[PDB]
Design an enzyme around this catalytic site. Structure first.
Site, PDB file in Angstrom:
ATOM      1  N   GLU A 155      26.371   6.654  -8.776  1.00  0.00           N
ATOM      2  CA  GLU A 155      27.023   8.015  -8.230  1.00  0.00           C
ATOM      3  C   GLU A 155      26.151   7.955  -6.868  1.00  0.00           C
ATOM      4  OE1 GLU A 155      27.243  11.119 -11.324  1.00  0.00           O
ATOM      5  OE2 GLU A 155      27.544  12.318  -9.612  1.00  0.00           O
ATOM      6  N   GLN A 195       0.923  -1.244  -0.053  1.00  0.00           N
ATOM      7  CA  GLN A 195      -0.090  -0.170  -0.024  1.00  0.00           C
ATOM      8  C   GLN A 195       0.956   1.320  -0.029  1.00  0.00           C
ATOM      9  OE1 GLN A 195      -3.625   0.347   2.407  1.00  0.00           O
ATOM     10  NE2 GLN A 195      -2.477   2.113   3.379  1.00  0.00           N
TER      11      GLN A 195
END
Ligand SMILES: Nc1nc2c(ncn2[C@@H]2O[C@H](COP(=O)(O)OP(=O)(O)OP(=O)(O)O)[C@@H](O)[C@H]2O)c(=O)[nH]1
Ligand SMILES: Nc1ncnc2c1ncn2[C@@H]1O[C@H](COP(=O)(O)OP(=O)(O)CP(=O)(O)O)[C@@H](O)[C@H]1O
Ligand SMILES: Nc1cc(C(F)(F)F)c(-c2cc(N3CCOCC3)nc(N3CCOCC3)n2)cn1
Ligand SMILES: Nc1nc2c(ncn2[C@@H]2O[C@H](COP(=O)(O)OP(=O)(O)O)[C@@H](O)[C@H]2O)c(=O)[nH]1
Ligand SMILES: [Ca+2]
Ligand SMILES: [Ca+2]
Ligand SMILES: [Mg+2]
Ligand SMILES: [Mg+2]
Ligand SMILES: [Mg+2]
EC number: 3.6.5.-
Lengths: 322, 436, 423, 54
Positions: B254, B11
């Site tokens: 990165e 959910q």
């Protein structure tokens, strides 16, 4: 009503605080590990600050400032004063000190060493010597021993001054109006620990004042009679300056303004006075006891200033330092 | 250009995914029918927004996204909602009955029966990528599906996409917004199983979001919509570097290089400012110095903790709007002289700064006011360990009595998995302590 | 996520009928199964309790069981009596003579297969069945003996589904026969093993509420059943209405039951008024935690709460609700176990019950429930030590050993509650 | 305080500021653990049905 927990059974001050709280009829003590408290009287070590302020709809207050140990450990205090620009290595009210491990400052101490009496000590064990090699043979701090203290008469005797300071959750700094002088019974001998160390246990004697404790009224009357000055003028101005300097220096690091829980803390500042009526800071105690006759007053003051300000109930004994 | 696939589990993952993709479409000028008039290359391209959106020959821009839940009611709202035309039906996956707040039920019992379908649907998305970077995984710690199925999926993703990065956005449980009583169990179990499979994970404490909505948005009773629109602003600022031209955090790798020097300690703290009420009649715009300063206020963090009592390992500042480097450096200079910022000794005391000139986008009819500049700070600080300590303590209270454990053993989980997971967390807490 | 409802014996069918009246009214269903409501919230989760038949008709997913026809004839003639599926009335003629053995082993065993045939047909047209709820008393013969036989058979056929009961516990103050403690002790052992959640409704508490609080000089069973149907409506609100909660039977059991045998809940309701006066949130919250509003005759101050659910209905300030819930937890700080963090849940539903602008339902898993089993155990032992009235049961083939075991099992249950009360 | 790695485009810019320098389970194994849990569920169910058979 309000709820609190006790986690330092060995604290005389907060046992009295807990007593008063219960006697108001508006505070309930919970079991030590109940998380749904308003007020934590915490343990001295490893207090779980990370678990405070996460209980839905509970305002939570604790009687210690996280990070105040920087002031209340000997090596920490030396490092803080040397490295904080508002205090400086040129700080005039703190004796020349060096941190020595058995970051280390052995060489600079030897340089300055090369009156040459120093005292080696630690917050963890005290040696006063005139020779550098003996101190090192004995984390520790080597501090310039104050060779010329102010000596009370009669007795030719040393003392230190204890001031109690309460910092509330708004970071107001409150100096308790009553301090104590803790005196040596033996005469001072610059040529035996008892005459150089003013600690109550070491002295415990009683010959000039009960329990080797002189309070401010007598000490002020003495300063008037013998030196034609007052305690406020010759000493207390410096004490208030030093207290405010120390606590303002660490305020950005420890303040609980805009934090999800609030702190207050009671501090014990210890000072030495030399024969020129110059005041020197010796140490800051993070979990002080109180003098027996002042417990009732100060503890009630803690409830009025530090607790009831956050949790209101259905002349001030403090000087507000600002 | 290298694609990213978003996966939303349970959910919380799904409803937060809805908020994020709604916001993405507004930021990129994509209409709810998938059309994007500013895109002059019809039916393809390798622009930066294509990392998150594929394109059909009819010009429809389709999210690279999979929604997964073990009961259908939350995803059915996606299927009938405003952005129903955006997703292909294969992207929305539902089972029949949920994991009942039970990690073991989501991981073992139900997970075993749906994991192969989920991987097939992900493989279909991966097959349309020329150079897949990896996955962004959204889920709650506390739900049976968000905890249990996610950890199963992360394991299988490491098997099927071994060289691909995996980032998490994880909702950490707070009793103020409907929690199950067993959420500490589920959080520890899923963190243990997922720890070695996640390269970087952004925790969002519902308590912090809830309090920001109360204080800054003046919402008495924040709903999931209020919470998720705020969360989506923060997610968007974190992922904006993947979706727009730039030189900082341009690929998932990165994030690890810049934020995570030690593999296990991969939970950066997010702080965001400013959050301003749209109903606020009169509002004065905050400067670069003020929003940067606000990044060091615990009240603006995604997890409530105290960075002054930890150490930094890395710090990234991500600005959106009217910001030039000179103001950033002037603000940092002032802040350094006034704040307790301590880095670990084996790291430089520095900040990586990214600026995107486009100001934050706000949902029309939302609670958030349009601002001229905002910032998200990502810092890897040991102070976030406070959140682990809080959770481990609640786990310990219940586990000492074995409360609710029979529900997990009943699903075929062994009791030793509890203590194994708890011991991993104990070592994790010790790791933070040694670093800090 | 369909639920299958079963109501067994006289008490079970009279309380069950009122329950279906109350929730049909809440969902806008008239006595003919036609929908005439004004809010889409009424239909969003209507399939949890109702099948849809052509003609815009909604039929309770309900099986009505008894070993004699009388009470079910009264149901069929009652208000909303035509709403039930005629095929779902399963009944014998012999009766069970207030005798657990007849319900469980002789008369009931002759009928149980045909009940299971109806259960199977209801379950087979479920998209995804959650589980079963049974309404019955424990002090008679059909609800108690055939009811627990039914639970055992349903578990065998559907071992992975949730089973809940609303179980009426007998009291000498509101008693039909002296053998009720025997029938209740035999049943409680079945419930310990084969239900996931049991709502314990004590006829003594219901009577005391009617007489002391509602100012009813002479409470009838109908007055008692008004309180029960109101409580059942309140406890099922989170299943029936599109709450933000997303709760099903299994989630409720997972959050309420920390140890498999300790699944016996004390329910409560507020307001209970002897009225048009507006009830404030402080009053609602204070009343719902008051022992006088709880429907098991146990003092919560004699034990500790393991888990608590508090469900508020109507339009009210959520902020005021939270402030009162915190205040009441402060007043009861000693009475919540501290080793289950955040073990008090607050839920809110916008739809109020009929005739009230707001109400609150309380569900507590408290160790004080041990007082209820202690009372039953005492009444059981006073008779059993003299083997009094046992011939009614040995005449149906039971042995005294089965009574000894049932008593031992209930005393064990009491010991377990005491163990966690002192934890 | 030194600025390094300054990159600029029409969308924005990025750079680094320095204040001070410093001083898996395989597929088969997963399948095994899932099957072991399934077998434990099957054993627990078989004990239940044996109990009900008694
Ligand atoms: N911020 C935010 N938190 C949510 C949302 N939905 C659920 N949560 C939180 O997520 C946790 C509950 O887990 P859920 O995601 O609902 O459960 P699930 O993953 O669907 O798993 P099951 O329903 O148990 O099968 C609780 O801590 C909730 O407060 C949401 O939309 N936004
Ligand atoms: N640099 C210095 N010069 C002169 N005297 C000193 C000194 N440092 C310490 N002393 C003396 O030593 C005594 C105890 O020293 P120290 O303050 O280190 O012990 P302590 O403070 O840890 C016990 P407490 O916390 O109750 O004060 C002091 O009362 C003071 O008289
Ligand atoms: N009849 C009900 C109603 C609820 C009702 F609340 F749902 F309405 C609950 C209940 C209790 C509860 N708690 C018991 C006490 O400890 C904390 C959790 N938690 C939850 N949920 C949490 C997870 O989401 C679904 C609902 N529901 C139980 N029985
Ligand atoms: N609350 C309530 N209790 C009932 C009702 N009818 C019977 N009882 C109680 O139920 C027990 C008798 O069981 P009953 O259902 O009549 O026997 P059965 O038909 O064999 O299941 C006794 O404890 C009665 O006090 C009722 O309508 N309401
Ligand atoms: Ca294109
Ligand atoms: Ca017959
Ligand atoms: Mg000391
Ligand atoms: Mg779910
Ligand atoms: Mg009867």
């Amino acid at each position: 009503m309000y709820t609190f927990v006790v986690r330092d059974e060995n604290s005389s001050v907060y046992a009295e605080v807990s007593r008063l709280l219960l006697a108001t009829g508006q505070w309930k003590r919970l079991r030590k590990d109940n998380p749904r408290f308003n007020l934590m009287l915490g343990e001295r070590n490893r207090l779980p600050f990370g678990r405070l302020g996460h209980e839905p709809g509970l305002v939570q207050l604790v009687n210690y400032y996280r990070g105040a140990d920087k002031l209340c450990r000997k090596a920490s205090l030396v490092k803080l004063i040397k490295t904080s620009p508002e205090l400086s290595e040129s700080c005039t009210w703190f004796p020349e000190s060096y941190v020595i491990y058995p970051t280390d400052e052995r060489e600079v101490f030897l340089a300055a060493y090369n009156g040459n009496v120093w005292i080696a000590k630690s917050s963890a064990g005290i040696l006063i010597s005139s020779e550098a090699s003996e101190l090192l043979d004995f984390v520790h701090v080597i501090q310039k021993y104050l060779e010329k203290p102010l000596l009370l008469e009669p007795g030719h005797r040393k003392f230190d001054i204890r001031s109690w300071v309460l910092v509330d959750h708004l970071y107001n700094i409150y100096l308790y109006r009553e301090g104590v002088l803790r005196t040596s019974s033996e005469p001072y001998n610059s040529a035996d620990k008892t005459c150089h160390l003013t600690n109550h246990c070491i002295q415990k004697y009683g010959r000039y004042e009960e329990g080797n404790e002189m309070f401010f009224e007598e000490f002020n009357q003495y300063l008037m009679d013998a030196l034609n000055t007052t305690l406020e003028n010759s000493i207390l101005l410096q004490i208030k300056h030093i207290i405010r300097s120390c606590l303002m220096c660490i305020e950005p690091a420890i303040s609980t303004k805009h934090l999800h829980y609030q702190s207050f803390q009671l501090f014990g500042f210890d000072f030495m006075v030399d024969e020129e009526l110059k005041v020197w800071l010796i140490e800051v105690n993070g979990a002080p006891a109180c003098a027996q006759k002042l417990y009732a007053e100060l503890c009630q003051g803690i409830v009025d200033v530090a607790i009831s300000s956050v949790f209101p109930l259905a002349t001030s004994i403090f000087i507000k330092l600002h | 250009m290298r694609e990213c696939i978003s996966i939303h589990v349970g959910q919380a993952g799904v409803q937060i995914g809805n908020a994020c993709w709604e916001l993405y479409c507004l930021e990129h000028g994509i209409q709810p029918d998938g059309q994007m008039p500013s895109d002059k290359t019809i039916g393809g391209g390798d622009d930066s927004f294509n990392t998150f959106f594929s394109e059909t020959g009819a010009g429809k821009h389709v999210p690279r996204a999979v929604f997964v839940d073990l009961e259908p009611t939350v995803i059915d709202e996606v299927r009938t909602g405003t952005y129903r035309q955006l997703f292909h039906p294969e992207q929305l996956i539902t089972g029949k009955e949920d994991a009942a707040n039970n990690y073991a039920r989501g991981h073992y019992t139900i997970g075993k029966e749906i994991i192969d379908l989920v991987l097939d649907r992900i493989r279909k998305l991966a097959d349309q990528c020329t150079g897949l970077q990896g996955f962004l995984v959204f889920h709650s710690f506390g739900g049976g599906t968000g905890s249990g199925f996610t950890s199963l999926l992360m394991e299988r993703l490491s098997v099927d996409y071994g060289k691909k990065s995996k980032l998490e956005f994880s909702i950490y449980p707070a009793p103020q917004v409907s929690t199950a009583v067993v959420e500490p169990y589920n959080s520890i179990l899923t963190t243990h199983t997922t720890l070695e499979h996640s390269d970087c994970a952004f925790m969002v404490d519902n308590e912090a979001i809830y309090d920001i909505c109360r204080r800054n948005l003046d919402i008495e009773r924040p709903t999931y919509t209020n919470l998720n629109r705020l969360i989506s602003q923060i997610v968007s600022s974190i992922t904006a570097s993947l979706r727009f031209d730039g030189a900082l955090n341009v690929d998932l790798t990165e994030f690890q290089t810049n934020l995570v020097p030690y593999p296990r300690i991969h939970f950066p703290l997010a702080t965001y400012a400013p959050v301003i009420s749209a109903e606020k009649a009169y509002h004065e715009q905050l400067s670069v110095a003020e929003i940067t300063n606000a990044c060091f206020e615990p009240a603006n963090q995604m997890v409530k903790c105290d960075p002054r009592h930890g150490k930094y390992m890395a710090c990234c500042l991500l600005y959106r709007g009217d910001v030039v480097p000179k103001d950033v450096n002037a603000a940092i200079a002032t802040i350094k002289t006034k704040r307790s910022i301590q880095f670990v000794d084996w790291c430089p005391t520095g900040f990586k700064v990214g600026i995107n000139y486009q100001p934050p986008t706000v949902v029309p009819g939302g609670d958030l006011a349009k601002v001229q500049r905002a910032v998200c700070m990502l810092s890897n600080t040991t102070a976030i360990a406070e959140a682990w300590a809080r959770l481990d303590h609640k786990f310990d209270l219940m586990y000492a009595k074995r409360a609710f454990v029979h529900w997990y053993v009943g699903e075929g989980m062994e009791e030793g998995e509890f203590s194994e997971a708890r011991e991993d967390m104990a070592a994790l807490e010790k790791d933070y302590e040694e670093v800090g | 996520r369909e639920i299958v409802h079963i109501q067994a014996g006289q008490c079970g069918n009279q309380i069950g009928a009122k329950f279906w009246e109350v929730i049909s009214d809440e969902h806008g269903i008239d006595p003919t199964g036609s929908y005439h409501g004004d809010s889409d919230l009424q239909l969003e989760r209507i399939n949890v309790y109702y099948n849809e038949a052509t003609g815009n008709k909604y039929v309770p997913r309900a099986i009505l069981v008894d070993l004699e026809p009388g009470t079910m004839d009264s149901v069929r003639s009652g208000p909303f009596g035509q709403i039930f599926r005629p095929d779902n009335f399963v009944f014998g003629q012999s009766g069970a003579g207030n005798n657990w053995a007849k319900g469980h082993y002789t008369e009931g065993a002759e009928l149980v297969d045909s009940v299971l045939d109806v259960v199977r047909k209801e379950s087979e047209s479920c998209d995804c069945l959650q589980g079963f709820q049974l309404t019955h008393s424990l002090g008679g013969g059909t609800g108690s003996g055939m009811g627990t036989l039914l639970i055992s058979k349903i578990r065998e056929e559907y071992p992975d589904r949730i089973m809940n009961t609303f179980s009426v516990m007998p009291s000498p103050k509101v008693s039909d026969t002296v053998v009720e403690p025997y029938n209740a002790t035999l049943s409680v052992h079945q419930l310990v093993e084969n239900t996931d959640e049991t709502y314990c409704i004590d006829n003594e508490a219901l009577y005391d509420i009617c007489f002391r609080t509602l100012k009813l000089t002479t409470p009838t069973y109908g007055d008692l059943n008004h309180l029960v149907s109101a409580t059942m409506s309140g406890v099922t609100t989170c299943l029936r209405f599109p709450g933000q909660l997303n709760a099903d039977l299994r989630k409720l059991a997972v959050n309420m039951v920390p140890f498999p045998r300790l699944h016996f809940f004390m329910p409560g309701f507020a307001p209970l008024t002897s009225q048009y006066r507006a009830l404030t949130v402080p009053e609602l919250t204070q009343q719902m935690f008051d022992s006088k509003n709880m429907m098991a005759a146990c003092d919560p101050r004699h034990g500790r709460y393991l888990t608590v659910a508090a469900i508020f209905r109507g339009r009210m300030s959520m902020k005021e609700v939270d402030e009162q819930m915190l205040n009441v937890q402060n007043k009861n700080s000693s009475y919540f176990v501290e080793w289950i963090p955040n073990n008090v849940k607050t839920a809110v539903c916008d739809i109020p019950p009929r005739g009230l602008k707001m109400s609150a339902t309380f569900i507590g898993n408290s160790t004080a429930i041990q007082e209820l089993f202690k009372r039953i155990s005492e009444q059981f032992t006073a008779m059993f030590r003299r083997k009094a009235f046992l011939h009614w049961y040995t005449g149906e083939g039971m042995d005294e050993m089965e009574f000894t075991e049932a008593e031992s099992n209930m005393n064990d249950l009491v010991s377990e509650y005491q163990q966690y009360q002192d934890a | 305080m030194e600025v390094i790695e300054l990159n600029k485009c029409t969308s924005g810019q990025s750079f680094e500021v320095i204040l001070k320098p410093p001083s898996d389970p395989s597929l088969e194994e997963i399948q095994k653990k899932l099957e072991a849990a399934e077998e434990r569920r099957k054993y627990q169910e078989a004990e239940l049905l044996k109990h009900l058979a008694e």
